[PDB]
mmCIF file of C-alpha atoms in Angstrom:
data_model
loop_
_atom_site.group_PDB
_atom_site.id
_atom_site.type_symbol
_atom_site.label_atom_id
_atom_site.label_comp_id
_atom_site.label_asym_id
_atom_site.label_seq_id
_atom_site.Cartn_x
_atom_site.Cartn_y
_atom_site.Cartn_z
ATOM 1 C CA UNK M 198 -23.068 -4.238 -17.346
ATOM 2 C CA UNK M 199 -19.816 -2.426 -17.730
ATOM 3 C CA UNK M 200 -18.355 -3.128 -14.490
ATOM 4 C CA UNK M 201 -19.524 -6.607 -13.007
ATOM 5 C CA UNK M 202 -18.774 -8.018 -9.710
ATOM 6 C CA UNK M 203 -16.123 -11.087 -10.433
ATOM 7 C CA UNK M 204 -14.569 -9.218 -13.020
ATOM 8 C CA UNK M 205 -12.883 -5.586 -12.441
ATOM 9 C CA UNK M 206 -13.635 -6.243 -8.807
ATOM 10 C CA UNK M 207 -14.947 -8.774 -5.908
ATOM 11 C CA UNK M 208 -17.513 -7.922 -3.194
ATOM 12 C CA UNK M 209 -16.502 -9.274 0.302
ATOM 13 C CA UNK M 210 -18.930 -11.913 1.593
ATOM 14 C CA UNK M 211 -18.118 -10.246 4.859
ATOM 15 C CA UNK M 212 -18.189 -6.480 4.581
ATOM 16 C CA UNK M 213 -16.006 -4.305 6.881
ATOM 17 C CA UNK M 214 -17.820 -1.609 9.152
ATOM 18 C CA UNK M 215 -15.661 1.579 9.288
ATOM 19 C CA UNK M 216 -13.271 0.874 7.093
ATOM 20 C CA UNK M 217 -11.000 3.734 5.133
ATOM 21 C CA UNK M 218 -12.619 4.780 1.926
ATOM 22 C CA UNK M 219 -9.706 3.257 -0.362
ATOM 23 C CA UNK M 220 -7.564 1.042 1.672
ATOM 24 C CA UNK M 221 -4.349 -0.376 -0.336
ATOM 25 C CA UNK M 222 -2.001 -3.134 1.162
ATOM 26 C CA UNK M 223 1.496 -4.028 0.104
ATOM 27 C CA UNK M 224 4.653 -4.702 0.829
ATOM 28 C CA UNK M 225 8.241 -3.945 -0.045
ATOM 29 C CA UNK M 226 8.982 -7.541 -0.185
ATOM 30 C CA UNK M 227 6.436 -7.506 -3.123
ATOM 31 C CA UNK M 228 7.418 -7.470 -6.617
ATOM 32 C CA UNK M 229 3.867 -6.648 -8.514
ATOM 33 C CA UNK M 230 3.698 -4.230 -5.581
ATOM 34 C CA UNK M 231 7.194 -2.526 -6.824
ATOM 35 C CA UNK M 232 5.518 -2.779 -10.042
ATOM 36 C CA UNK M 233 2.325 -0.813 -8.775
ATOM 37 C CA UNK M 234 4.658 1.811 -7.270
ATOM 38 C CA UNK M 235 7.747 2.439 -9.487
ATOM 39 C CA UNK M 236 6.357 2.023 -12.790
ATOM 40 C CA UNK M 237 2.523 2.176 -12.375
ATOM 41 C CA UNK M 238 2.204 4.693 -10.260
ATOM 42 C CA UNK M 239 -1.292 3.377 -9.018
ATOM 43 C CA UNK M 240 -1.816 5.212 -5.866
ATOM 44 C CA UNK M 241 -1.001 8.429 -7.344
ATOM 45 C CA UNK M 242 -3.201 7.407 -10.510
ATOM 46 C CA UNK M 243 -6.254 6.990 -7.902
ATOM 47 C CA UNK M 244 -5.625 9.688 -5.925
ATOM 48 C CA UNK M 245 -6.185 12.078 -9.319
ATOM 49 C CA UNK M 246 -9.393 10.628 -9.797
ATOM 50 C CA UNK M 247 -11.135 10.110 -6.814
ATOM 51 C CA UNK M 248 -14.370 12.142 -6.189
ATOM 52 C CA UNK M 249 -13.708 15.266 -3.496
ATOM 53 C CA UNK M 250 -13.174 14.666 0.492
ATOM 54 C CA UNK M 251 -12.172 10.693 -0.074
ATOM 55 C CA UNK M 252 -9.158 9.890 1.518
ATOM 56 C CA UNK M 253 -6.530 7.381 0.743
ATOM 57 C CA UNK M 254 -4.902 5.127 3.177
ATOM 58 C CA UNK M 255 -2.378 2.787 2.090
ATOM 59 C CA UNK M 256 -0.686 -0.057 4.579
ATOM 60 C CA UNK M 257 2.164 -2.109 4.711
ATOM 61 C CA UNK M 258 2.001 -5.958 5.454
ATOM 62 C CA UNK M 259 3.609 -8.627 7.648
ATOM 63 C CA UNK M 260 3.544 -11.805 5.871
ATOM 64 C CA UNK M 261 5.951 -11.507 3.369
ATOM 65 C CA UNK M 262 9.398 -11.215 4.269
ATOM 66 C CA UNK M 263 9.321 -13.002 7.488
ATOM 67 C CA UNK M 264 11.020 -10.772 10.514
ATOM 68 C CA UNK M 265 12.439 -8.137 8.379
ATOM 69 C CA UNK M 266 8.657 -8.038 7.135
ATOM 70 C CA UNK M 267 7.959 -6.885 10.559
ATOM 71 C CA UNK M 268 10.278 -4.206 10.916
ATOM 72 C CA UNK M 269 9.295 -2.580 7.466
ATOM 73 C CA UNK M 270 5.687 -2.329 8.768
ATOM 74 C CA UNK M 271 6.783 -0.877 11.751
ATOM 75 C CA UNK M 272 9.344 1.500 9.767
ATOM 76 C CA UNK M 273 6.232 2.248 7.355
ATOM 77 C CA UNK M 274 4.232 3.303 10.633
ATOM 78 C CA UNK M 275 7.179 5.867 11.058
ATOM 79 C CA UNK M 276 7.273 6.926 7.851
ATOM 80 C CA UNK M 277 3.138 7.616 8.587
ATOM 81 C CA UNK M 278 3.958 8.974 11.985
ATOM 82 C CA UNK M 279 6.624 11.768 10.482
ATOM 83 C CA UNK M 280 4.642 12.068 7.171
ATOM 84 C CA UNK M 281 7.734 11.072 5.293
ATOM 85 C CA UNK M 282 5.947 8.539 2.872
ATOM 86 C CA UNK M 283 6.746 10.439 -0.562
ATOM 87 C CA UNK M 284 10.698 10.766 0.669
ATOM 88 C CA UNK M 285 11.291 6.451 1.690
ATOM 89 C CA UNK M 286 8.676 4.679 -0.448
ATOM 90 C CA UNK M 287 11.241 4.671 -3.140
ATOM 91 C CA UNK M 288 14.346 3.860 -1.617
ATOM 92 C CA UNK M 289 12.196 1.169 0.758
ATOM 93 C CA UNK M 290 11.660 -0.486 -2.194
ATOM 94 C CA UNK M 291 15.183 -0.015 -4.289
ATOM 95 C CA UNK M 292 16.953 -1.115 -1.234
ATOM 96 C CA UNK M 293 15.155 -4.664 -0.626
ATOM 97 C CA UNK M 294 14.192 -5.364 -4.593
ATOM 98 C CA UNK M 295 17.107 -3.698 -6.709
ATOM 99 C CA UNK M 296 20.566 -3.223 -4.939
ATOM 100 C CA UNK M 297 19.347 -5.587 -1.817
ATOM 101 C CA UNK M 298 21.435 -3.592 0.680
ATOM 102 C CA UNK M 299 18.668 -3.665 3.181
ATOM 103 C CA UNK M 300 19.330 -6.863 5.124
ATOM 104 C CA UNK M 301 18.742 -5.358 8.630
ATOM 105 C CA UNK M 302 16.291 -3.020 10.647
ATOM 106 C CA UNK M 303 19.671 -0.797 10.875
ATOM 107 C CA UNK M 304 19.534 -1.427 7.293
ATOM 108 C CA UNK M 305 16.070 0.606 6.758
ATOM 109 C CA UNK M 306 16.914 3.177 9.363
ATOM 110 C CA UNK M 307 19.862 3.983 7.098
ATOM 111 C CA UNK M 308 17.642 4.904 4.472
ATOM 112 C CA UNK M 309 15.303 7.177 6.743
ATOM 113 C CA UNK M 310 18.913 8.997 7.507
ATOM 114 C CA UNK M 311 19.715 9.589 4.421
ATOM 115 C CA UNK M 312 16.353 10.431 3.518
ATOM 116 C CA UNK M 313 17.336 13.333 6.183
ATOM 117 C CA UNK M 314 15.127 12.180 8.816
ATOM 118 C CA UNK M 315 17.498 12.727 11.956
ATOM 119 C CA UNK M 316 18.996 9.625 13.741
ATOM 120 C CA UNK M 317 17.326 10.748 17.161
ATOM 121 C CA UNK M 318 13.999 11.380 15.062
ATOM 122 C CA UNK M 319 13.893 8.153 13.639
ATOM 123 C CA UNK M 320 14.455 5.921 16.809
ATOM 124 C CA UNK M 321 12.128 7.953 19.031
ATOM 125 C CA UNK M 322 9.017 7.351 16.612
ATOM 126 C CA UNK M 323 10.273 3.820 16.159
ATOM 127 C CA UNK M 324 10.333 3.679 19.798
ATOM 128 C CA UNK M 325 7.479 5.567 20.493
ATOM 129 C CA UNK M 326 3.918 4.069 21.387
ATOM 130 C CA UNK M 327 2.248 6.177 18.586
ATOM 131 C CA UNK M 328 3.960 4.358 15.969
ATOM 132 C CA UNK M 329 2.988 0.882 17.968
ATOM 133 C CA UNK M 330 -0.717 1.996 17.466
ATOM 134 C CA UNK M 331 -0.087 2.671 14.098
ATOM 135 C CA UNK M 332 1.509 -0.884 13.687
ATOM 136 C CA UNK M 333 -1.748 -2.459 15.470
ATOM 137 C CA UNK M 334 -4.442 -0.285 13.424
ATOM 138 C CA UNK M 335 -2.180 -1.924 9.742
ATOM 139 C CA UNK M 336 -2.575 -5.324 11.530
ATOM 140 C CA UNK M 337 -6.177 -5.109 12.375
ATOM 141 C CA UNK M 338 -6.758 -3.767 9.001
ATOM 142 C CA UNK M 339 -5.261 -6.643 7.128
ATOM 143 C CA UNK M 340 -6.640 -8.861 9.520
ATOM 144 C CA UNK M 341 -10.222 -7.330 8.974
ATOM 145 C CA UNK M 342 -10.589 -8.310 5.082
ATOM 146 C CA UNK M 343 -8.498 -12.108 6.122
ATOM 147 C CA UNK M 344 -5.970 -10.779 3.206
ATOM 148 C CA UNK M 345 -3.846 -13.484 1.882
ATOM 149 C CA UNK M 346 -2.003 -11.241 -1.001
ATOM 150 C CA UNK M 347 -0.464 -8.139 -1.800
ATOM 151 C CA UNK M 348 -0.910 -5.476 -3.669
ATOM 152 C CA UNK M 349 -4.700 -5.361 -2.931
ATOM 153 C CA UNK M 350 -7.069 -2.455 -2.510
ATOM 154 C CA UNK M 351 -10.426 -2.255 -1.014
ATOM 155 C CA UNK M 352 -12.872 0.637 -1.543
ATOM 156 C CA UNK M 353 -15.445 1.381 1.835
ATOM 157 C CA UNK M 354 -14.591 -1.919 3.102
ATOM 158 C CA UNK M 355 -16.893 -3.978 0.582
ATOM 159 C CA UNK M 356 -15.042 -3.936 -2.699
ATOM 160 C CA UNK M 357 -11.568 -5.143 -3.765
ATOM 161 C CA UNK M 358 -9.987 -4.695 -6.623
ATOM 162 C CA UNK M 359 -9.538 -7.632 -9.462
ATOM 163 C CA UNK M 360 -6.838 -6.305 -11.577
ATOM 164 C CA UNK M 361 -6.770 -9.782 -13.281
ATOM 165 C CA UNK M 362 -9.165 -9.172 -14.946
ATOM 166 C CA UNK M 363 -7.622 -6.428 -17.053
ATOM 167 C CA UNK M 364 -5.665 -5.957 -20.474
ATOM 168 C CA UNK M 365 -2.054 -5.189 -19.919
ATOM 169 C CA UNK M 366 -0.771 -5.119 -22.946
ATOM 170 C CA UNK M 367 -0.781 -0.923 -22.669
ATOM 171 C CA UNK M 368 0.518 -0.090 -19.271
ATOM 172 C CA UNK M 369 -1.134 3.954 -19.064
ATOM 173 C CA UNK M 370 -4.575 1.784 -20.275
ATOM 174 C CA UNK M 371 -4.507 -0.429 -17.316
ATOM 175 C CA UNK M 372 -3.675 2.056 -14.529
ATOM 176 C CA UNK M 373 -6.302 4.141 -15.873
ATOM 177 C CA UNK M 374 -8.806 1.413 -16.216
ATOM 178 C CA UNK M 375 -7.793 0.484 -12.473
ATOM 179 C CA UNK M 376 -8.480 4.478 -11.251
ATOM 180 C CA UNK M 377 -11.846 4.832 -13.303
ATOM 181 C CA UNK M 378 -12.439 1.161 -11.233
ATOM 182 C CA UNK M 379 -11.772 2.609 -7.366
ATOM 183 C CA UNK M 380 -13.855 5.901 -8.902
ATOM 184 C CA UNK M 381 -16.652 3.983 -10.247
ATOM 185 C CA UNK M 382 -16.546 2.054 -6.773
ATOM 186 C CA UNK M 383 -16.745 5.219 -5.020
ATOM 187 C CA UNK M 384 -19.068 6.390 -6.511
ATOM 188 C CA UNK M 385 -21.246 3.086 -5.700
#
């Protein structure tokens, strides 16, 4: 066919019951993952193509990064918490890839600040037991599909995405090959 199993995606062995529609991992420790954010663009690519009332869920991930790992999933649950995702993502990812000024949790609460998230804003959420539920439902998520790497997407807990096996020699071709993929997948 035009979209085989083992080659624009993989079928888990072990499908996941209740799982988000499109579930994407990643995290800012990632370089393909910076990739898939500051110069693909994937998520929003997806997002523009993806059949009415399916919702998009994307998670950040522990092992990479070791304990400053940790605190950027927990930071990421704030950033889900306040809805602040569009305003951190970027800087998140500047500050431990680029200028690698973020060395510290007080590090990534800096950039919430001058994100203008307020001090006593921040630290509450971080604090609060909302955002520790948050942190547990990206853990059990991970967990749920064993997943070894980042980035990685999963459509209705059955499919995951093989960019591999794509051409990218054109960058706009393979993000859009990628979206028509999670559509078709949808769709299936």
């Amino acid at each position: 066919a035009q979209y085989e199993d083992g080659k624009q995606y993989t079928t888990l062995e072990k499908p996941v019951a209740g799982a988000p529609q499109v579930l994407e991992f990643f995290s800012f420790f990632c370089p393909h993952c910076y990739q898939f954010e500051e110069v693909l663009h994937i998520s929003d690519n997806v997002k523009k193509k993806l059949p009415e009332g399916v919702k998009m869920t994307k998670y950040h991930v522990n092992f990479m990064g070791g304990d400053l790992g940790k605190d950027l999933t927990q930071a990421w649950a704030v950033a889900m918490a306040l809805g602040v995702e569009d305003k951190v993502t970027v800087p998140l990812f500047e500050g431990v890839q680029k200028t690698q000024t973020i060395r510290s949790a007080s590090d990534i609460r800096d950039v919430f600040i001058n994100a203008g998230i307020k001090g006593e804003e921040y630290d509450a959420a971080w604090n609060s037991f909302v955002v520790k539920s948050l942190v547990a439902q990206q853990e059990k998520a991970a967990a749920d599909v064993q997943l070894r790497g980042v980035p990685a997407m999963f459509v209705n807990g059955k499919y995951q995405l093989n960019p591999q096996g794509m051409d990218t020699s054109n960058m706009d071709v393979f993000v859009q090959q990628y979206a028509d993929t999670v559509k078709y997948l949808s769709e299936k």
